[PDB]
């Protein structure tokens, strides 16, 4: 029912956007079908974790606070696709990084996907009292993500910033705010129960869940083989500020740091193996299990503090936490 309703609202959103281009923007059918195929390619196929999180938060707050139910659930699906379209926009920008008309279309796709989040919100929420506050929180989180991207891209340009506090800064602004905090907040807005929650504990939980997700993703990027990871792990070659790098530098000897700095950030298949060997010899996979266990306890305890004043809201946070756990 959740996934089925989510995909049913997707057809409604796509039909409005494409028909609007046909009726108001004077677009020809060849380009309307072109944009339909592009919208399906970039927005459909993932796991829809961000979008479905908005629905799970909304359905809990209406049963644990009747035509208002049907409207809130529909508003959550539109908010769910706002984030999915936003995530589609971010991924398109990633492909541009890694008279050329395909690059021209890629940039155009990114601009269109971002604009579509505004267009679908200005339409389905035209008479909602929260349209202005929803767009401001949405735009501020998008700005936060762009700032987080700047922290990540320049993590090796200005190993000084290879610290655990800067790693959390990258994770907080580039991933945690739009993946964990935003879907939870959007569920509170469509349920109108925004000021009834502790935003401090909620913001704190969103950062810890994103941090837990990123550390696990960093270790899998280095040790999980490509066919089991779904991609080629490239953090070492790209010299990323991963959890493995900042944890190695704190417990390595003065020589192992020199051997790390001489082997990190290279495409040589053996230097990457030299970095993996250094990670192995430091028992980082053992430190990984302990570091994640401590984060998980901070998550388990913070959900209880949020349950005291927002009982039903914490049930969805545990469901969201289970997807990462």
Ligand X SMILES: CCc1cccc(N)n1
**Residues that bind ligand X in the complex, under the rule CB under 6 A:** 90-91, 93-94, 145, 149, 174
Contact in structure between 194 and 61 (CB atoms under 8 Å): no
> Rounded to 5 degrees, what angle do the CA atoms 75, 79, 81 make?
120
Tell me, residue by residue from 125 to 164, as one string, x for binding to a copy of itself by CB under 8 A and - for no binding: ------xx--xx--xx-xxx-xx-xxx-xx--xx------
Q: How far is the CB of 145 from ligand X (least distance, A)?
A: 5
Span interacting with a copy of itself, options 44-52, 105-113, 196-204, 220-228, rule CB under 8 A: 105-113
Please, which contacts does 299-307 make with residues 24 or more away whose CB atoms are closer than 8 Å?
299/205, 299/208, 299/209, 299/212, 302/201, 302/204, 302/205, 302/208, 303/205, 305/198, 305/201, 306/197, 306/198, 306/201, 306/202, 306/205
Alpha-carbon distances, residue 281 vs 2, 134, 152, 253, 276 (angstroms): 46, 49, 27, 12, 9
Binding to a copy of itself (CB under 8 A) within 232-251 occurs at 237-239
294 binds a copy of itself (CB under 8 A): no
Contact in structure between 239 and 265 (CB atoms under 8 Å): yes
Contact in structure between 36 and 101 (CB atoms under 8 Å): no
When CB distances are held under 5 to 8 angstroms depending on the partner's kind, the choice from a copy of itself, ligand X, none that residue 21 binds is a copy of itself
What is the C-alpha separation between 81 and 84, in angstroms, rounded?
5
When CB distances are held under 5 to 8 angstroms depending on the partner's kind, the choice from a copy of itself, ligand X, none that residue 31 binds is a copy of itself
Q: How far is the CB of 310 from a copy of itself (least distance, A)?
A: 25
Name the binding residues.
94-95, 98, 152, 217, 221, 235
Task: Give the footprint of a copy of itself on this chain (CB under 8 A).
Answer: 21, 25-27, 30-31, 93, 96-97, 99-101, 103-105, 107-108, 111-112, 114-116, 118-119, 122, 131-132, 135-136, 139-140, 142-144, 146-147, 149-151, 153-154, 157-158, 169, 173, 237-239
């Amino acid at each position: 029912m959740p996934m089925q309703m989510f995909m049913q609202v997707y057809d409604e959103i796509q039909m409005f956007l494409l028909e609007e281009l046909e009726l108001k923007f004077d677009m020809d059918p060849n380009r309307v079908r072109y944009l339909r195929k592009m919208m399906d390619t970039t927005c459909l196929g993932g796991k829809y974790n961000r979008g479905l999180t908005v629905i799970d938060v909304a359905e809990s707050l209406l049963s644990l606070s009747g035509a208002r139910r049907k409207r809130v659930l529909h508003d959550a699906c539109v908010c769910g696709w706002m984030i999915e379209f936003l995530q589609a926009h971010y991924l398109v920008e990633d492909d541009i990084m890694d008279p050329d008309v395909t690059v021209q279309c890629a940039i155009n796709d990114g601009l269109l996907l971002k604009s579509w989040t505004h267009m679908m919100a200005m339409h389905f929420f035209a008479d909602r009292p929260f349209l202005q506050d929803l767009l401001c929180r949405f735009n501020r989180v998008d700005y936060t993500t762009a700032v987080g991207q700047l922290y990540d891209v320049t993590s090796m340009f200005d190993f000084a910033e290879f610290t655990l506090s800067n790693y959390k800064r990258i994770v907080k602004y580039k991933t945690a705010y739009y993946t964990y905090l935003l879907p939870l907040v959007m569920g509170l807005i469509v349920s109108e129960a925004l000021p009834t929650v502790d935003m401090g504990v909620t913001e704190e939980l969103a950062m810890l869940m994103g941090e837990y997700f990123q550390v696990q993703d960093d270790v899998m990027d280095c040790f999980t083989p490509p066919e089991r990871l779904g991609k080629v792990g490239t953090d070492i070659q790209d010299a990323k500020c991963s959890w493995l790098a900042v944890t190695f530098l704190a417990k390595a000897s003065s020589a192992q740091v020199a051997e790390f700095k001489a082997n990190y950030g290279s495409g040589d298949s053996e230097k990457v193996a030299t970095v993996r060997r250094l990670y192995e010899e430091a028992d980082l996979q053992g430190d990984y299990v302990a570091y994640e266990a401590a984060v998980a306890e901070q998550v388990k305890e913070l959900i209880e503090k949020l349950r005291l004043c927002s009982p039903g809201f914490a049930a969805s946070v545990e469901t969201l936490w289970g997807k990462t756990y």
